Each structure stands twice: as structure tokens, then as C-alpha cells.
Paper text:
Among the >600 human ubiquitin ligases, [name] plays a particularly important PQC role, being an essential and conserved E3/E4 ligase found across eukaryotes. Aside from teaming up with various ubiquitin ligases, [name] activity is linked to two specific cofactors: calcium-binding protein calmodulin ([name]) and [name] (13, 16, 17, 20, 21). Our data show that the evolutionarily conserved [name] complex forms a megadalton E4 arena, in which inward-facing ZZ-DZB domains of [name] act not as E3 ligases but as substrate receptors. The architecture of the E4 megacomplex is conserved across eukaryotes, but species-specific adaptations allow [name] to perform its precisely tuned quality-control function in diverse cellular environments.
[name] and [name] bind at this C-terminal interface, as predicted for the trimeric sub-complex. [name], known to mediate calcium regulation of target proteins, engages [name] in a canonical manner, with a long hydrophobic [name]-interacting helix (CIH) of [name] docking into the cleft between its two lobes. Although the C-lobe of [name] adopts a calcium-bound conformation, treatment with the calcium-chelator EGTA did not affect the [name] occupancy, suggesting that the cofactor is stably bound rather than acting as a reversible regulator. Still, its precise function in the [name] complex needs to be discovered.
Author numbering:
A (entry chain A): 3463 to 3578, 3590 to 3604, 3609 to 3647, 3699 to 3775, 3788 to 4039
B (entry chain B): 3463 to 3578, 3590 to 3604, 3609 to 3647, 3699 to 3775, 3788 to 4080, 4087 to 4110, 4116 to 4301
C (entry chain D), D (entry chain C): 289 to 296, 301 to 331
Amino acid sequence: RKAAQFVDLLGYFSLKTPQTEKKLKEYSQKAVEILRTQNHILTNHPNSNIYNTLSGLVEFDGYYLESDPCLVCNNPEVPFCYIKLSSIKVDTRYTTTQQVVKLIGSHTISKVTVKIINLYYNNRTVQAIVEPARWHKAKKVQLTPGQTEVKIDLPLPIVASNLMIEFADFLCNACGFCKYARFDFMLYAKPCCAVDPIENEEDRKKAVSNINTLLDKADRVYHQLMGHRPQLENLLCKVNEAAPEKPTSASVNRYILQLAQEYCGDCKNSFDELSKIIQKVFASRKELLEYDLQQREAATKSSRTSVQPTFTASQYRALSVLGCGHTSSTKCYGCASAVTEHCITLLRALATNPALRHILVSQGLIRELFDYNLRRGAAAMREEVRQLMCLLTRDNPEATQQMNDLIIGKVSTALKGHWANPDLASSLQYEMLLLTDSISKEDSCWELRLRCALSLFLMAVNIKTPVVVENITLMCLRILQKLIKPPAPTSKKNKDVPV
Amino acid sequence: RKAAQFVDLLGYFSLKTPQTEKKLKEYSQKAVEILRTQNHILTNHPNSNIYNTLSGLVEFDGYYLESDPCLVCNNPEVPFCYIKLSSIKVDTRYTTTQQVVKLIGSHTISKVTVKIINLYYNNRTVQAIVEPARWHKAKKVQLTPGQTEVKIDLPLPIVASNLMIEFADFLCNACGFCKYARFDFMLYAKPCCAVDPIENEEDRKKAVSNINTLLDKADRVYHQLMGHRPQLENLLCKVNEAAPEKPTSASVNRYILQLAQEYCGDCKNSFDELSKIIQKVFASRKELLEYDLQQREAATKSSRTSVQPTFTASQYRALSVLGCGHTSSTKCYGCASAVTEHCITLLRALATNPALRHILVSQGLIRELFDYNLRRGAAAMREEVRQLMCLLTRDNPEATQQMNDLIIGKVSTALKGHWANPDLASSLQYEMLLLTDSISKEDSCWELRLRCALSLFLMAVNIKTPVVVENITLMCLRILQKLIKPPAPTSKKNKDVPVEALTTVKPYCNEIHAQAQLWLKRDPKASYDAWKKCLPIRGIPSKSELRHLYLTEKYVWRWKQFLSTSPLDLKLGHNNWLRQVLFTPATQAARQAACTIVEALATIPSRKQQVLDLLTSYLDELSIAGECAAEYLALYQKLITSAHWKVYLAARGVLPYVGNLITKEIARLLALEEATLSTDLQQGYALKSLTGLLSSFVEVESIKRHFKSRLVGTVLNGYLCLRKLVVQRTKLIDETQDMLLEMLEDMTTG
Amino acid sequence: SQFLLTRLMSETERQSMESERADRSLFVQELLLSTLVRE
Amino acid sequence: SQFLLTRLMSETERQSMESERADRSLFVQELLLSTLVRE
Ligand SMILES: [Zn+2]
Ligand SMILES: [Zn+2]
């Protein structure tokens, strides 16, 4: 989902630059191939059935049944917030002119507002507050006398776990009570997942042991999370039968309530814990790798015969830990869904060029959109896919005929066995919606669309079943009514005269 | 629903009475015609869509969207309850020896218990309690002196609205307080819907006005109730789309919550209010009609010329108001459903007669049941219909073939377009359940059912979509597993022997006589009986005799081959459906079922050798399908628990195979570690499994003594490469390192 | 419990049925092996 | 709102379009009446 701006610019540039037809063909082929591969990935995915059936019953944010956690989906953009210091305060010590505070964890502070100084910080976790060389200065500030509120700004946000405040120029050593003034502290911060730094060998051993412990805990939680899947299958199968049960929030089917509890209650909690542990493991690994790299470079620099290997600017970023945590998992459902959304948006932008439209319809895009993306995704994406399918047939009689053939064939096949299964007549809403959308836009191929609508109407006007009347005949009647009574004219000379 | 006992008796009498075949045909035609008419009514009902959609989402008792309220459905059997007189008390008055009480409404009282007497009652509503001619005596009870509890038992329940208690033989006229004793009252009563009786003309006029007011109120409530239908259908349309929405009882789809609130919250209340008003109207109408008939009869009896027309006993019941409130409405969903249930029960009882079964299947009952009643109704009735459909085909090859054709056609048609719509694959559960039920009941037509199951299995075994694997391949695998591993014997002579020792024929060592390709095409030369005729029966010695058996077998086999159908050779192909099924990540149950299947396929050593050969060929799939192989390994390690199989596998050269696989995926681990920093929670599973397998191969002494000189290099190279790992390290890699070091130290002691 | 319609085997036939079960199991084993044969 | 791809008629053509809409309406009326003629 990070690539919205890229595909936006790509579609715009392809639309604005006039280019030869071979390049247009290559671009269309690339886009359609990506769309096809993502569709194939989505349909055969092991969790495809569970998510597809759960989408229409419960409301959930993410996909929590994934074997390999995806870093892209696990680290959304959390914003900075105003936090009072006492809310996260755990241990404190006051001395004659200094104050030392320990937080609950590691925080990314941006600016500090003090209401009625020298600021030090460090990111080493200690258990005793009593426990000048292990502090880092942040900002030195001078105050005009009589100032009441001072907003110290840190140009670079600091990742700190312990803070210290010193009064260089003008408190109780037991309780910290001050008679001159009262100070209150606010932070422009957010929680951060980072570990203590490594400076020697014993710290390296400590880091290795902590990483092993975290991996063990992650494995246990992962097995707990993967143990929920058979229960979800059993409940899904029980829901699919839809047998009536005899007994207003508790009047819903008990199986649907159990499904909601099993997914949005426990799978979500296990997924959140697993994500936290994975982030901690990743941070620790990054710290360990950075220390190892520094040690190796220091060891190599001591030798004299060997020359230091020069790196270009891109090579440094590739080698270093800068480009390490921006890759999505391979078999990720959410990322594949996002890529399909980007493909639809790019293709909608591309189809506004008639030559590209002809090339796209020659690739075979209409059938791929019909079979796969009509019923998959959120409501907005489905409407967008209908819009793209309508646009691809704007002035192409062959494309309109092909789409009409697809719609008519599906409706006829469903209606053949409607007597024995109502879902056949209840699973045509997207085909009829497509027909409505295509007809509602005026073009030069209105006759073929009207023929399709009228043929479907006369084929299903004599069926007394209510589901056919509500799902087939009503839509065709609305299409015919719209065509019979056109909107009132807006031209000035025809503002009064009737149709 | 009142006609359960009638259809029970009807079925029993029809079954026990011996009767000619013409009467059997008439009875079957009657039952099937009623069933067909009810099915037609159900599928075309105006509210059928709404109820069918709501049944799978909410839990509702009745059908509250009916234009004509049904007397049978809104008049259930309300039982008597024990009620305090104070709880229904509204107005009271007391005098020296009488007490007068008014209730909130009319009650049907049956027994009155007093815990520490003359009882009067009436059913005339008054506003003032103060307001001997307007009371009816009910029961006179005398008390033994010093008694504390009395039970006035009314032989006939009384419908009363006001009560009176008078102490005929042995109270404050302002407050009612009595110092001699204090009395408490119990009633064995229940609410009733009744009106004041009509005795003169002005009472009749008041009754007419009251009925008009009630009709007006009922019309208003009915219009309010009917106004909910467009909103219900709008919410149904919005639910059917099933578009995902983003935000544990509150996490359900908001449209489903709104549907539950709209149906079970407001429609139910309006239906109950309408039912109450309809009952009041019916009571008032009955009272007015009875009064009018009585007045007319009194007027007619005054004349002398006209003689009173005698009525027989049945005619009196027909004419009087007695036969007035027991008839169901025509366009009623609930009553039609009840009639369908009764038809299914009666047909199930009837089908136990073979001649009736044949006539029923000749009427065309199987297709009607398949099309209509498989998926409609409660779960109990659905299982009942599946049982009846299985029973109708108990020993009839034609009926079994017809049912199989329906099932196969439906599954194939759904599977054709499954790629473009998963709902098709999700709506075969009842067809597959029917196939399962039909197979699980042993009969003489088992071969046809097995053919249907196997055809469906082989058609849909190679589809990778999880919905097909969960909904088609899994059911067929379970059927196959039930057929392969039959239940343990219970007879005394076979209480110990296994199922392998019970067969009456002995399969040939190196040949397979069953031929599935011709069997699936209904070739009579490849049938089950033909196959059984081809095998030698299990028989119930000197060196000369052993030699004679050897040459007789050899040259008889040569003679048969010279004559030649040709039996297949036991050479298993290395690419089949088995590899696809054994490692499918869609569902674990499919893998477990396949593992049991192939475990049972390996009993005689001739088949065991080939099964182990194929499973060994499947070894390279551990890396691709890391945890999904957990079942397959658990089978493989179970099949080589004996030493000689390990030695045979070593003699075929699997140790270099396993070593090469370990080395290759260790190289992959090193390459991944050098490049990326991502975390894999299944890393080292394939390594751990393969190294454990190598350890199991090595522990036995002969292979350890022989194969050490070729494996030390791979072992030490792997150990050093794993030791080089510093960041992409998990617990499993640590265990692999330990076990590899143990193998390295054990190898180098000679 | 009062419904009449809700209330609707020797040892020799028992061993016969067990032997038939064994024969059917063997036939299904052979028929499933026949589909794995190399082409 | 910063997305470029989101931001992707005279009077004579308007009268022409209105007349064409009326003509199509008349054609559809004739077509619908043609299916109600007695056979
Ligand atoms: Zn992802
Ligand atoms: Zn009814």
C-alpha cells in the first residue's frame, strides 16, 4: 500500500507523454501481466476461503492468519502525541539541583513543553534509579527571568528510556519538595521499539541471549495462533449450512457470534502479540548487525597493506542497515490485495486513451475483470472495477458484444436451475449492476446494451418466483423506465417544452 | 402442526394392514400429491425470499410478515400457573363478612388454595367495586375447626373477572383488617381472552361499538406491520452483497445487526399486538353470534305452526360456535411448512414396505426430494429427508443410479464455473452429505455408490483451490478411508484376528488385477465379481511338495500370460495425485486422511516396497512445504520402524539423497542469511527433519559401519557452515547443530 | 415416546458380513493402487 | 486531493443530445408496444 504515489505519477506520465505504439503495447502488457499474477495468487491462497467468507459476516481490519508476518502490514504510520511525564513515570530521584526520571519503556521524544535547564537522556535499561559518562546531552537552554512556559524543541527526535533535568544556573535530596517553584512536564512523543546499544563483548552475549528468549516466546505464540485455524474451519462449515435455529443483539445466529469472537477476539490478540515480538526481534537483530559491522571495519582498518574499499552512494545504502525493513512478505494476502487495487487504478487511468483502450481490450482484460475482480475486494473497489469494465467498451461494438455475451450467458445458466437453488438467482446482483452501469452512460453502442436488457427481461418476465422478480425483472424494468422517460432538458430553448 | 398424532396413526395403520396393490397405489399417489402441492406453495410464496434469507442469519420463532393472521399459529397451548391474588389485584372492598376483588382482566381459574367459605364470580367489567343478582356461585366448602390450608377444587374452570368471598358460617368495614385471622389466596389460573356477556339490546349495541373500535385499531396496527417490508428487503439486498467493511458482539456486520433489530425487535412486537387484537375480535364475534342465535331461536319457538327442526349430534357441532376456531389460513407459511414435515414423516414410515417403496420411486419422489426438500427447513428435517432419500434406494439399482446421476450432474455443473465464483463450490454440502449417508449404509448396491464417489474424487483431485479441497476432495477421501478401514469385528470367532486375515481371496504378489480405467466406464469384464473370480481362494510339507508348488505356480502364470485380460504390473509412477494431496496446505484433515489411506495401502511386503519407494521419492518436498509435511513425516518414520526396511532403503542409495538435500538447503540458508534480515518462524524445520531422518538411518550398526567413509565430509561441511551462522539462527538450527555434532563424534570412533 | 412410528442380527450373518467387508476393503485397495500405476 | 489521476459540453450538441434522447425514447416505446400485440 506504500506505492500509491508511484502509480499515480506513473499513470500520469504515461498519459501525458506521446509515445509510439510498441511502447504502449509493452506498457499494457506489463500492467495486465501484474494484474493476472496477483489474481492467480489471491484465488489459490490457502486462507482465501476463510477471509472471503468472513468478509461478509464480521468487520475486521487485517488478516491475522498469516504464517509469515509482513513488516509492511505490521508497522503503520503512528503519529506523535502529547503525553504528560507523570503518566509514563516509573522511578524518580531528586537531588539538590538535578532530577532523574525513568520511563515505562523507550520513547521517541520530539519537543518538551515545561510549565511553571539542561536536558540529558540515555537508552540503557536499569532497575535502580540510583544505579556523567552514561548520559547524552540534548539541548542547552537559557531562560529570561520570569518566564513561565518554555517549549524546548529537539531538531532531531531522541529515542530515550531515561531522562535527566539539570539546573545549571539560577530541591530536597530526600523527597524532592521545592519551595521556590513548581514544575510540570509534557512530551511530544510516541512509543518506540528499540533496544539498548552494544559497546563490548558482554553486552553482545546479553543481546544474543535476549534474542534467543524472544525467538522462543515468538514460536510459542505463533503455534498458539496457528492452532485456531481448525476451529475457524469448523465454525465456517457450520455457518455455511445456515439451518434455522430457534431461540436484540443476542438474537443473531449463535454461530456468527462465535465466529466473531474467535476471529476478532482471540486471533487479533495473538496477532498483535506476535507483531510486537517480531518488531523487538528485528530491532535487536539490527543492533547486533550494526555492532558486528563496526567491529569488522575497525579490525580491517588496523591492517596496513589492505586498502579501504570505496563505495558509491547507492552501494552504501544497499550494504548498510538503512535499507533493511521495507520489504513485504512473499505470501501476503493484504499486500496482494493492495497490488490488485493499484493495478485497477492504473488501468482506469490508462483506459482514457482510445489506442491504449483498444490494446487493453485486445489483451483480454474484460474476461479477467469479469471472472475475478467483480466480486472481490471492498465495495469501492468493486464499483471502480465496474466503472473500468464499462469504460473499456465505450465505443467498441465487439467489446460491448463480448461483455453482453458474458452477462447473458451467466444469467441464463443461473436461471436454468433456479427452481432447485435460490442462491443462483441471488448471486446475479453484480452482473445486473454491471448492465445497469453500462446502459446508464450514453454512447454510440446503446442499441446492443438495450438488446441485452430486453432479451433478459423477456426471458425472465413470466417466472413467478419472488427471487427472480426482485433480482432480474425489477432491474430490467428500471432500465426500461429510465430509457422511456429521459431526464428533463436543460437547454435554454427547451427549458419548458416536454419530451 | 396439530396433526402429529393423526399422521402417526395413519402411517401405522397403513403399514400394519395388508392391502391390495391398487389401494397401495392410491395411497402413494395421495401422499405424493400433497407433498408436491406444499412444495409448490412454498417456493412461490411472496415472503419466501425474506424468510429464506433470514433463516441463516438471525434466530426467529415465527413468521411475522403475514397478511392474514393464522389462528393455528397464534393460539399455542398456554399452561396453567400458580398466581398470587395480590399480583392481579387492582380494586378491593371489604364488609362485615364479605370481600370483593377485581382483577386486571379475565382469568381462567381452576383451583383456589387458601393458606391461613363461599366463592362467587362474575365476568362483567365495572369501574367501581361498590357498584345478589350479578354474582354466580362457584363452590361451597366447609372447614374443620382449626384448619389452616384449604383447597377449593373447581370441577370446571371458570372464566372470571371479579371475585367475591363470603364467610357464610363461623372484618373492618373501613380498612378490612381482621384480628381473628389473616388470609392469603392462591390461584391456579392463566390469562384468557373473553368479553362481557350480552343480555339485552343496549349491551348488544355496546358490543357492536367495541368491535368497531377493535377493528379500527387492528387495521392501524396491521398497516404499521406491513410498512416494515420495504426496509427489510432493502437490508436483505445490502446484506446479500457482503462487501467487507472496516470497524466482541459489536464486530458483527452492521447490516446483520440492523436486520436482527428490524425483524426480531419491531416486526415481532407488531405481530404480537395484532395477534392480541385479533383474538379479542374473535371472542367478541363469538359472543355476539351466540346471542343472536339464542334470540332468533327464542323468537322462532314462540310461533306454534313451525315445528322445531331436530339436528343430529354432528349437525349440532357444525351449526354451533363449537366448530369455529380451529382452521388455518390459506396463505400461511408456517402451516405449509408443518404439512411438509408431516408428509416427510409419513413417507419415511411408508417407505419401509418394499412394494410401497417401488411405487413411491416410480411416482418420481427422488427428484422432488432432491430439488426442493434437501435445503429447506430445520436441520432435523434436512437430515430426515436425507435419510428418506437413502432409504428409497436401498436395494434398487435404477433408483441408486438416478440419485447418483443427480449428484454427479450437480457437482460437475458447479465445478465448471467454480473458478469465477466460489459460492458454487460452497453450495455442494448437501449433495456430498447425501453421498456420504448413502455410502455409509451397506447394501447390495455399494458398487454404484463407490463408483460415483471415486469418479467425483478423480475429477476434482487436481484442483488447487482451497474451497474445492475443503468441500469435495476431503469428503471423498473420508468416504475412501471409511471403505478402506472397516470397523473392527465384533464376532466371537473374529474378536482377535485383524481385517487382513478375514479376506477369502489372496492377491497376487507382483500383479494388480483391479483396473480402474475400465471399471469407471462400466465394463462388465472388470466388475467386482469378475475381479473376485480372478484371485485364488485362501487355503483353509516336504521339499518335493514345495518344488511342485513352485513350478506349478510359475508355469501356470506363464500359460495364462501366453493365453492373454492382461493384469497390470506393480510399477508405481512417480507423479500422481498422491503427491498433490499429501502436502496440500489448504487443510490438514485432507493430509491426515491421505496418510491413513496410504498407510493402509501397505500391508503385504510387495506393496510396502513400492509404497516406501514412492514416499522416498517424495522426500524433496520437505523444504517447499515446511510445516505442512508434519503428517507425511509422521507416516514415513512409522513405516520404517523395522530395521530391514532401513537396510533395504540404504541399499537403494537414499543416504546420498538425504545428504545432498541437507547440503543444498543449508547452502540456501547461508545465501538467505548473507542477503536479507527478515524473520521466518518455520526456519530450520526442513533441516531438523532431514537431519533426524539421517540419524535414524545411521543408528543401526550395519549401515553405520558401511556408510561412514562417504558421509563424514558432508556432515563436517554442514556442521561448519551452520556454525558460521550468526544472525539467522533459531532454536531448530541449534538442535540441528547439536545432533550433527553428535553424529560427527559417533562416526569417528574406530 | 408414545409415537408408534418412531419405534420402527445373528452370528452366522455376522461373520458373513465381516468377510464381505474385508473383501470390499481389499478391492478398494487394489482399485486405488491401479490409478497410481506408471503410464 | 493531491492525486493527479483523480482530476481526470456546448449548447448545440446539447440540443442534439436532447433530440436524440427523445427519439430513442420513442423507439423504445414502439418496441415495448410491439410485444403486446395479439398473436
Ligand atoms: Zn503485507
Ligand atoms: Zn398457520
